[model samples]
Target chain A: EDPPACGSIVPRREWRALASECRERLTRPVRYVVVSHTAGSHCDTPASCAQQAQNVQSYHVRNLGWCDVGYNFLIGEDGLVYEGRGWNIKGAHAGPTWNPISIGISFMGNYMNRVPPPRALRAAQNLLACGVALGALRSNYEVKGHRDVQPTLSPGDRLYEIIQTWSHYRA
Target chain B: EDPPACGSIVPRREWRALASECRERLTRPVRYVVVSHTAGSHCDTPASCAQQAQNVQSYHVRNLGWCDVGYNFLIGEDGLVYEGRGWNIKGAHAGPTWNPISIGISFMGNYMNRVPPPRALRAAQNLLACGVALGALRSNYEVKGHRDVQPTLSPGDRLYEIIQTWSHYRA
Candidate 1:
């Protein structure tokens, strides 16, 4: 089946996604969606959020030595999706045991004490639905916060609570 | 002669706080510290958390029509302390009774199911100490979660649990 389509996404070109390379690739009908937080700045306007997205790529690629932005897709408080590696692409976001089977979509800011705007949450859910429609994510895809599979405080406390309520979340 | 210091604080100037037209100011030797979560996006690093601080002030000032950012201080997951209305200044955080009586220190993210980073907690406790040194808060000032004073889901479950363990936390 063709990849499910959703709302507008800021292309790598549009958001200044860095040119770093990634070797990992996830198989189609990916079964997991790993949520995380940037633990950094949040942007609400298109211009600022796009810059925030670029800064993320700069850090992950230049500082972490990762292949491109590690997340498959990044959501912004601006209620827009900042494409990272894209839905069909493999990412280095979560460690092994799930990266190959999961798609990582990180919020563009910390959530331990703050929650992303509702519009931002809607955008992410919309992105997931599209991914399933496109056959990139399994219709029965399981959702997990970054902390679930790893010993990290990612996806923040507030966002994590919201995660548990999502239709796809488990454990 | 020494700096009134505790944790590293992103001063009001650093967070780009707007000059206030507010008249409220809290009494010295404050008796209470109310801990609340911003219920907004969090930042993992200094730079981003600063942005989050700015957004909060924008909300309070522009949207909520407050004269300034609502809290006396805001703590970030990055472990940095952010200045708001400040210890001697009254803030719009919480409701009327608590706002006038307590030193409102907010966590810069949500905490529903997630917890703040260790560094963030460290900053918070240390900031309280600094408040004591400045005579902004009483040496024996009590600590309370936002939910304790207001009937909101603030400070989240994980944080509410943690706060109860602090030496100063009361019911």
Candidate 2:
């Protein structure tokens, strides 16, 4: 059975995620979507992408000692969106200024040399639509590249260019 | 001519320090000293310690893009003090709360497994005396373990214990 609101996306249980300790909630109908990149391994197959998601979550929780994965969701090259902290919890993606107010979606691989395939891009857009339907994001939520709000080259050059052309993207 | 007040301490030029771009001046007669440890390699000989000092400064400058080595001075197991940003320039040690008001002196190695040798301890004490003599520190300045001012376990267990007994140590 598909989960409600974002049933098209993978649930944490499906990804075999570890239990999270995050408690801070974002205000409903958040107005921004901060996009980023994992800047690590790329995985296009279901098995490999699932493991990569687990690895990223492990690094955030065990190595960095964060309460959970830093993103609200992670997009995989397999054209699947993996749940991370989810829509309600505040993410750790775009620093203190934007984390509490935005849903952060990081493509699960570096986008410097190559952008995510069209299916992967479509998956992220679908997730955004799901967020709006779930009443977690505003219909007019503005999209921002991670670099726009932080001192990093995240959301990579290739992906950054693509996000700029997205319908809801702002300067 | 030797440096007037801390002539015995090694000058940055003698250590072949990179030219520092730091310019912020700490208010005179600073009230605190925050002691830390490099948590890296140990060096007991003059040549080895000098190289280690250079490596640390390069990491802070080239890798971290910090203005300098982030300490007012570094203590060596060779029983010498390596000048960093010195007394006038504000250091990057500790956090925003303590860096501006404290003289930061980090011993040149990890102290978790073994306490720094007696000479290294003496070197730090001598540097503190030199700071006071140079009118860069308060005569009755307080000393704090790096752990006290931040979330780190730095200055390590052995060194933190030893600093706690110093006359100027507070809390």
Candidate 3:
């Protein structure tokens, strides 16, 4: 049977994502949520952002030579959550220290100067809540910026500022 | 009288700030607030944070050859606000376009990885509210991350993420 209730998530097929070649599995009830951004283009419609999601996957799989898109999920300015590696697999978003223990969610645009709209923000938050409901993330999961445990600025400045206010965000 | 009913702000004298040598002034009811960080050491105690504030002023004044501390004010992990250029003076924090129109409030410490404590967050917010009440900042003032208008990451990642959630933060 399909997994239990999580919120409305855009499945991999819907986003036309490639099948992952990734093999490592993560333990359940992951303790951290790492937020990030693509530092690329943004889309305001489902069709466009979905295509953008594919571009991301292609770049990672074909160009970067990764098993899948680096993130576990991708958030769109269109207010949708596009599944990447999803709950069970380890992601390549953060470094070695965090990739094994955290879920990486990357927003679909640069946010150094701009912020995701309220609806987009809500979508990401709801996705995390859904993760908890599905037992993929712990009830007491801590939120972290992609830069928190790494040296690069994955989540842009504006978006990074917004995550710090989230209830689950850790120092 | 004095200025007006602002919140509990630690004056420059209390923080042992050096006298300002610059003379340009900002027009009242400024339209923006720029949030930043020292990218240096952090302090949790009032006495210690106060000392940190002084060190910041000294660097700006003595080394950078600025009039005073570059920010309009400083927020501490100690949960206090330290006055920099204060309400009427122009700040050197952002750039030519923003330096004159925005009040620069910096948190003392690097926040690329760590976030400011809850008390520090509250102190900055309260300081903004106080500025609006004092007619130093517009009631409709917009908040921006340092990187939003400039090229550097003065605010750090973790702290930058937190400011985006403030009621007045703008894209």
Candidate 4:
């Protein structure tokens, strides 16, 4: 049975995320939350964001040929949370050292110099709250811009600047 | 000497903090992070949290006649960081045993059952990162819930549950 929906999360089924297939699980009450971004075009429309979500999975699956989507969750500029592999599933967004202990969340779009809309920010923040509530993330969860834990700037400068101000952020 | 701001921390001056002569300093690179909660009403906006910040100082200064507002910093449900005694000054949040070596951060609410919102959590985490970046907190600093060192449900059971999952938590 599908796990109960997390606060406003657009399930993979909603986005047509093919068959669910994540290779690992990052044990419950994960201690870390790593935020990333598509670093591609931003998706502001709900319909377009759904397609964008598919594109991301396609890249990770058809092109990269590893698992399903690489992140456990995806945030759309449309101000909605799109489930990637979902909370329990392990993701490949960060390196091996980080994947097993953290939840990976990516935003849909390139955020190099621009901050996301306020609604988008609220959605992402609220989503984490749900993770903590569902026992998927620990209450003392540390948030990191993708670059903080990895080499690339997947989460972008503006995005990093914003989340950096968050109370749970860690370098 | 002026200390660089930590993340989006509101300067004490900005928050209209009363003047003070409390100058006992916690050595640079503080070794512990003590988490506590105000056990008062919670706020979720910049304006309200600012008012909450002012209220906290009033109690410590006017009611109890203390040196200043006790915590090194305060996190608001609005997701902003409020400067209290700040990073360099020794805070009165924890008792004598811990006051000397730690930076105390208090959430602006009771958390016995309700958890601080994600924004408040984010602000707190980011403030610590800024503390580390400014060389004000130890990279290996240990985090302790108020109950860990003294007599109180200070940080609250729910909030304590959350901090326990922190990577640096000790006891």
lDDT of 3 by residue, B91-131 (tens): 87776668878899999998978988999998988998888
Least well predicted 10-residue stretch by lDDT in candidate 4 chain B: B1-10
Quantify all predictions' global Cα lDDT against the true fold. Answer: 0.81, 0.86, 0.85, 0.81
Stretches of candidate 1 exceeding 4 Å from the true structure: A1-171, B5-7
| A83-163: candidate 3 lDDT, tens digit per residue | 999899998876556889999999998898898999999999999988898889999999988767653355888988999
Model 1 CA lDDT for position A100: 76
Candidate 3 accuracy as lDDT = 0.85
| TM-score of candidate 2 against the unseen true structure | 0.55
Each candidate: chain B TM-score: 0.96, 0.95, 0.95, 0.95
Reference contacts preserved by each model: 0.00, 0.00, 0.00, 0.00
Best by lDDT: 2
The CAPRI classification for model 1 reads as incorrect
The prediction achieving the highest DockQ against the true structure is 2
Backbone Cα, N, C clashes tallied per candidate: 14, 0, 5, 11
Residue-wise C-alpha lDDT for candidate 4, range A1-171, written one tens digit per residue: 644333555667767887756667778989999999988778765567779999999888999996798888888766567888887888888999998898999888888888887557767887787788679899999998889888897788888889989989988
lDDT of 4 by residue, B1-171 (tens): 353332545667766778876889888989999999999999765557779999999999999989999988898776567778877889998889889999999999999989986656756776676677679988888999999999998899999999999778999
Q: Please, what are the lDDT tens digits per residue for candidate 2 over residues B121-164?
A: 88888788877888888999999988676534578889999999
lDDT, candidate 1, A1-171, per-residue tens: 444346478888888776757665678988899998887777889999998888877766665456788788899888999888886668776665576788999998878779888899999999988887778889999998875765346788899999999889987
